[PDB]
Design a protein around this motif. Sequence first.
Motif, PDB file in Angstrom:
ATOM      1  N   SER A 167       3.721  27.864  62.357  1.00  0.00           N
ATOM      2  CA  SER A 167       4.764  27.584  63.337  1.00  0.00           C
ATOM      3  C   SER A 167       4.301  27.912  64.750  1.00  0.00           C
ATOM      4  O   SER A 167       4.550  27.142  65.684  1.00  0.00           O
ATOM      5  CB  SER A 167       6.029  28.370  62.993  1.00  0.00           C
ATOM      6  OG  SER A 167       5.838  29.759  63.194  1.00  0.00           O
TER       7      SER A 167
ATOM      8  N   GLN B 197       7.629  28.400  54.121  1.00  0.00           N
ATOM      9  CA  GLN B 197       8.570  29.513  54.163  1.00  0.00           C
ATOM     10  C   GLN B 197       9.227  29.722  52.806  1.00  0.00           C
ATOM     11  O   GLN B 197       9.411  30.862  52.362  1.00  0.00           O
ATOM     12  CB  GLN B 197       9.632  29.257  55.232  1.00  0.00           C
ATOM     13  CG  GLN B 197       9.179  29.529  56.653  1.00  0.00           C
ATOM     14  CD  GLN B 197      10.107  28.913  57.682  1.00  0.00           C
ATOM     15  OE1 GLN B 197       9.974  29.159  58.880  1.00  0.00           O
ATOM     16  NE2 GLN B 197      11.053  28.107  57.218  1.00  0.00           N
TER      17      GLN B 197
ATOM     18  N   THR C  61      12.080  35.792  57.817  1.00  0.00           N
ATOM     19  CA  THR C  61      11.235  36.887  57.350  1.00  0.00           C
ATOM     20  C   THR C  61      11.985  38.213  57.389  1.00  0.00           C
ATOM     21  O   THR C  61      11.846  39.044  56.483  1.00  0.00           O
ATOM     22  CB  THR C  61       9.961  36.972  58.190  1.00  0.00           C
ATOM     23  OG1 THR C  61      10.301  36.968  59.581  1.00  0.00           O
ATOM     24  CG2 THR C  61       9.045  35.795  57.894  1.00  0.00           C
TER      25      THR C  61
ATOM     26  N   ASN D  37       6.449  23.447  57.278  1.00  0.00           N
ATOM     27  CA  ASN D  37       6.775  24.830  57.615  1.00  0.00           C
ATOM     28  C   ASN D  37       7.913  25.352  56.747  1.00  0.00           C
ATOM     29  O   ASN D  37       7.869  26.492  56.275  1.00  0.00           O
ATOM     30  CB  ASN D  37       7.135  24.941  59.097  1.00  0.00           C
ATOM     31  CG  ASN D  37       7.261  26.378  59.561  1.00  0.00           C
ATOM     32  OD1 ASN D  37       6.849  27.307  58.867  1.00  0.00           O
ATOM     33  ND2 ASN D  37       7.835  26.569  60.743  1.00  0.00           N
ATOM     34  N   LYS D  38       8.946  24.531  56.530  1.00  0.00           N
ATOM     35  CA  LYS D  38      10.044  24.939  55.660  1.00  0.00           C
ATOM     36  C   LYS D  38       9.563  25.164  54.232  1.00  0.00           C
ATOM     37  O   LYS D  38       9.960  26.137  53.580  1.00  0.00           O
ATOM     38  CB  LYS D  38      11.158  23.891  55.689  1.00  0.00           C
ATOM     39  CG  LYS D  38      11.875  23.771  57.022  1.00  0.00           C
ATOM     40  CD  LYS D  38      13.071  22.838  56.916  1.00  0.00           C
ATOM     41  CE  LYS D  38      13.686  22.569  58.279  1.00  0.00           C
ATOM     42  NZ  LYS D  38      14.179  23.816  58.923  1.00  0.00           N
TER      43      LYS D  38
ATOM     44  N   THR E 186      11.884  31.308  61.843  1.00  0.00           N
ATOM     45  CA  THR E 186      10.951  31.896  60.888  1.00  0.00           C
ATOM     46  C   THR E 186      11.005  33.419  60.935  1.00  0.00           C
ATOM     47  O   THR E 186      10.974  34.082  59.891  1.00  0.00           O
ATOM     48  CB  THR E 186       9.532  31.399  61.167  1.00  0.00           C
ATOM     49  OG1 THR E 186       9.515  29.966  61.140  1.00  0.00           O
ATOM     50  CG2 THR E 186       8.576  31.917  60.111  1.00  0.00           C
TER      51      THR E 186
ATOM     52  N   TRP F 176       4.952  34.001  53.881  1.00  0.00           N
ATOM     53  CA  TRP F 176       5.690  34.032  55.141  1.00  0.00           C
ATOM     54  C   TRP F 176       4.754  34.118  56.341  1.00  0.00           C
ATOM     55  O   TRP F 176       4.994  33.470  57.365  1.00  0.00           O
ATOM     56  CB  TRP F 176       6.673  35.202  55.140  1.00  0.00           C
ATOM     57  CG  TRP F 176       7.811  35.029  54.179  1.00  0.00           C
ATOM     58  CD1 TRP F 176       7.957  35.635  52.966  1.00  0.00           C
ATOM     59  CD2 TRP F 176       8.964  34.197  54.352  1.00  0.00           C
ATOM     60  NE1 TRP F 176       9.127  35.231  52.371  1.00  0.00           N
ATOM     61  CE2 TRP F 176       9.765  34.348  53.202  1.00  0.00           C
ATOM     62  CE3 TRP F 176       9.397  33.336  55.366  1.00  0.00           C
ATOM     63  CZ2 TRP F 176      10.972  33.673  53.039  1.00  0.00           C
ATOM     64  CZ3 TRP F 176      10.596  32.668  55.202  1.00  0.00           C
ATOM     65  CH2 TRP F 176      11.370  32.840  54.047  1.00  0.00           C
TER      66      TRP F 176
ATOM     67  N   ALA G 255       3.274  30.810  57.177  1.00  0.00           N
ATOM     68  CA  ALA G 255       4.284  29.989  57.836  1.00  0.00           C
ATOM     69  C   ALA G 255       4.454  30.391  59.295  1.00  0.00           C
ATOM     70  O   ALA G 255       4.600  29.528  60.169  1.00  0.00           O
ATOM     71  CB  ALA G 255       5.614  30.094  57.090  1.00  0.00           C
ATOM     72  N   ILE G 256       4.439  31.695  59.578  1.00  0.00           N
ATOM     73  CA  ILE G 256       4.549  32.165  60.957  1.00  0.00           C
ATOM     74  C   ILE G 256       3.382  31.645  61.785  1.00  0.00           C
ATOM     75  O   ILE G 256       3.561  31.151  62.907  1.00  0.00           O
ATOM     76  CB  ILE G 256       4.620  33.703  61.000  1.00  0.00           C
ATOM     77  CG1 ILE G 256       5.886  34.210  60.309  1.00  0.00           C
ATOM     78  CG2 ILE G 256       4.561  34.203  62.436  1.00  0.00           C
ATOM     79  CD1 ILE G 256       5.888  35.700  60.053  1.00  0.00           C
TER      80      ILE G 256
END
Lengths: 444, 504, 312
Positions: A206, A194, A221, A190-191, A217, A199, A202-203
Amino acid sequence: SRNEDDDEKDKSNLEFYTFFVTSENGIRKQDQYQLESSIEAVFAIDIPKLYFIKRNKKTNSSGQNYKIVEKYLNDFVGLEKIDNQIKEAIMNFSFYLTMDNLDEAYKSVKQIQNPSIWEKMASMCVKTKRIDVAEICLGNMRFARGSKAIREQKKEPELDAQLAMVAIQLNMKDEAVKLYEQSKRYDLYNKMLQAEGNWEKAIQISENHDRINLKNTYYRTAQMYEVSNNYEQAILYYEKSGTHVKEVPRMLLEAGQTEQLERYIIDKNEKPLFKWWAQYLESNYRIELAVKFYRQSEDYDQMVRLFLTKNDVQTASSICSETNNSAACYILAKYLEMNGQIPEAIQYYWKSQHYTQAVRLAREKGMDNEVMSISLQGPNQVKLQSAAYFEEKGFKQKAVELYKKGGNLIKAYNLAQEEKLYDEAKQIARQIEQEEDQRNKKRD
Amino acid sequence: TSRINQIQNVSSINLETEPGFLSLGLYHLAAGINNNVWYYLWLDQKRNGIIKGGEMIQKRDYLGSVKDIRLNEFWAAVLTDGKCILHTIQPNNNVKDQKFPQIETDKAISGIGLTNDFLIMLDSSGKIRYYHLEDQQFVVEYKPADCQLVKIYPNFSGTRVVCFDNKGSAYLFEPAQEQFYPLEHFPQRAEKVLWDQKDPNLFAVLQNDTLITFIINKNNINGTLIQPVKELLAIEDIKNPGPPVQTILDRGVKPLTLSNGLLKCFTPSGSINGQNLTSHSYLGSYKGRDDTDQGHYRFFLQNLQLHKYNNCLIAAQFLHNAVLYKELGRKALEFVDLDVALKSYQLAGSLSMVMTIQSFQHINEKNIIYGNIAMILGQYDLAQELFLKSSQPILALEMRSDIQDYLTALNLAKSIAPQEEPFICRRLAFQIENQGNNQEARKLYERAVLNKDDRPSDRSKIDNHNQLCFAGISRTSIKLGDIQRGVTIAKELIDNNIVIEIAV
Amino acid sequence: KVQSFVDEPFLPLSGHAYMLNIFNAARFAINKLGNRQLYGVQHSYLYYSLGKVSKQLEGYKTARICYEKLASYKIPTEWSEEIELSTLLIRSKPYSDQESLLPICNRCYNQNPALTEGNRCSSCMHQFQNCFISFENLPLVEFKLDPKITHKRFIELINSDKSKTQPNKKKKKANDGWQESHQGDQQVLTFNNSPQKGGNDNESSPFLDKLNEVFEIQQTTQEYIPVTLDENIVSSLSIDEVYWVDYTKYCYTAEIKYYKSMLTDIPLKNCQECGTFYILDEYEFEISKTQKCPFCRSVDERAGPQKDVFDF
Ligand SMILES: [Zn+2]
Ligand SMILES: [Zn+2]
């Protein structure tokens, strides 16, 4: 959702496998290659290059032609720069790594050494899942950044995470993603997602996997949107973030959009926003609007403070009589200390539940009924202090009474023998036997 | 002249004598002819609002001539050929004259400067003195001040000052640090220097016909940078000193002041022209809606020259070329602009960059960040020197061990923190079994073993080091024919994979 | 706390108590942390806030020290000119601080500078105490108990000793010490640049005699050894002043610390769930404002048993 159908156009049903064969170790698998649908047949095999037959569908003639396609091996992809003597060293190291013969391969690589050769070394070490040779090679890059990443990442129980980090260091994201999925680790992935830029992906990852770092996150963003000067998106992701009461005013004052901040605060209609805006108004010498927003925020200490700044004590007294706030009375009594208004100051201190200051001041100034009235409702410590003061005073009987009503009854018993009374002494004896029974009834 | 492109209403003040010197304050107006001084006021202090006509508060007469007049808000300074005096404009009831400056020398003050709260006086002997108004004390004194002083020019608040000295020399002085800074590439006949109210970093110098612009940089790595900003049309081809940018000024016109990149040029018939310096002129000309590519590259170049890194970032994101991304990221990293460098490097497509950038944004320490930026970007010895200058030389030792030079790393480890001698020595053992020097491995491993066996605390790391050194001596003794000891110590050691490797 | 102060733009004319509290918090944090550069802190906000609050509250020595430190620091360009201007302005101000603000170290009776390494004085090696609400120095000293003496019967024995040390006029040590303090009084004050030595030894009590003898012993040894007390001094003590801290709820037998307050007039409240000290004024005001212990984050004692199954 539809992740297996559209990719079959360019994928064929032929796979190439490479093997090293010797009598000592028999047969060992070296590498695997996936052939595309454009590849028709395997032509031959060579050390630096592999040749295949590829169809020519784009030709308009009835008979489609076939061309030779030249490709590099997995351990030779990228190295375009003079390949004459390196092939021997690479083959020897791979052959010795098949049997894990560490020292023979090390002494074979000893005689040449080269930073590009060292990075190919590290890449194939990551491929074969070996760590010690990989970190030795990373030492041999003179690549301090990768070593720092190694040092900061070594504090992890999972070795797969370290392998994925090294994959990031050597620039292949797909291998790192595969390793992270293999190890059932998502926070590091996830990192990375990001960081790289996607983004929204990643959201989604997560929220469907971790859901714990979702607030982080969202904050990241929102920060990215703030960097992109998208004020509306930044404030939006601020309210979807954990905190928005303080980030939005800070970004608005950094940008300087006072009218936008006014629209936002009017839309929100929140007390902390009113307090912040009133504080700013007072900072920029807008006293009346600051007072109005303080009234909308119900901070009576601020009105008392502002009216005390201009020595307008009458309105402060009216406000403290109406609202009857505790801290407002406390600060008003603090002002009255300097203003020579000791009785009202003591009364306000008593009202504000600040016991010891008022009782000590009145003890110095010599008030008797007020201090005992305060101590009756006060805690044990205030009772003890006030009644000890009464012992210091000329009348000790009232001190005996206030010990009787206080938290120390053995003291009342001892005073009963000291003053050698009988009726109050027998009442104190009844009280002390009651307290003895109360203590004995707890647990025995 | 508060607004732009238009002039507000003028206010008339009456006079009967014609002065040769004029001075303007926030509230007052000073008119000075030979040995005669006139003062005017608007309303009575506080906030003006409505402005009244000229009021004659006090007519001042002097035994000598009035060489120069200065008036900030509350005090006034009058210069005569040999003596400076002070006055209060608002009150006349007070009968106590201001404390006369200067010393037993009583010489003419070469340079006078009034700020909001401070007075600077520079004498012909070459000494500059700072004076507090309400305290009347000499807070700062600097007698040597290079060879000799000629002219002085302070900041509007007194934070910086520039001194013009003999043979056309220039120096920069900061009262806080009490150290001079030599200056380079300065004309020898420039008459005045104008500061910028928008940013204290930028200022301008007026030659008889040309304008030069200078900037002070303190965020530069291991250096306080002052240089004439250049002009360049190359596509990142050359970064080397060249001719400075010069603005062509008309004949017989004096720009009053420079602010917000706008110079208050005064031309005959009472005309005021904002104009612009020929460095921010193209910055204001560019619009960024469609434009072209050559113009966009010039806009990016001028932003890089003026360190406007937000415009640099937008100019970069317009053109997806990777080399420009790398160059902008490197420049932003070198000018400790962490966010801009991170954005540029992420737009380039690198993750190893952003990992270390985010790690660096954590630390707010000064020398640590300077050394880390140096060791990421360029040379490594300077980073080691910076880390030694910091309070964490262990990071420098780790960096030196990272390069595996082992000639300076061991000496540094012995110098600063000799309690980490074993571990680094073990690394040397690997190197000494890399070069083929089998015999030296025995003594190096033995020294490491003795050193780690001396200290009994924290037995886990000691045991790991002991196992590794035992493996080393076993392998080097097997390679050297010492079979018995090697096989024995292989027998006592318990780690299975290491024993398997030794047997292999 | 200091960040909640600094992020809010400051009021040119603010309350003196708020400024004093902010200064105390910043000084305490700077003293306790010092140079560890832990995760979370930036070491610049604290110095800037301390400089501003000192400039508003004299504190010339601390202002100069923190301004030099910030000069060694790097800050955004919005504050550099203000910092240098404030430094040059304060250059003209007199030295030697302003007194009446430096903390007073117990078992030393001497004045120490605000910034003294890891929150200890130069005269002895003793850890300071502060009320977390106001960050104000407390008049407290630490002492130990003999291993033979057990705490459970120690409580009842000291209670009996306090009870017997009032009516019986035969022989008692507490009233003897009080009378000796009332009769003979020695109070000397000496002025220096940074420090101040207060020779206040009027109260002649066995506890203070043992304390000064132990202090001389530690000065001879140039090290720190906590004071160990015997049965006589324990019997000479009372009940209200002791403020022992217990960690029994977490560990049944780990350790126990014992503290004595020199000033019996000031009341102190010790939250045993978090084991933290508070002034009764500020603690009572905070409890009235909110029914939650600030650092403890637990329910208040006055309220009922909020810990039920639903909350569990
Ligand atoms: Zn002490
Ligand atoms: Zn608590």
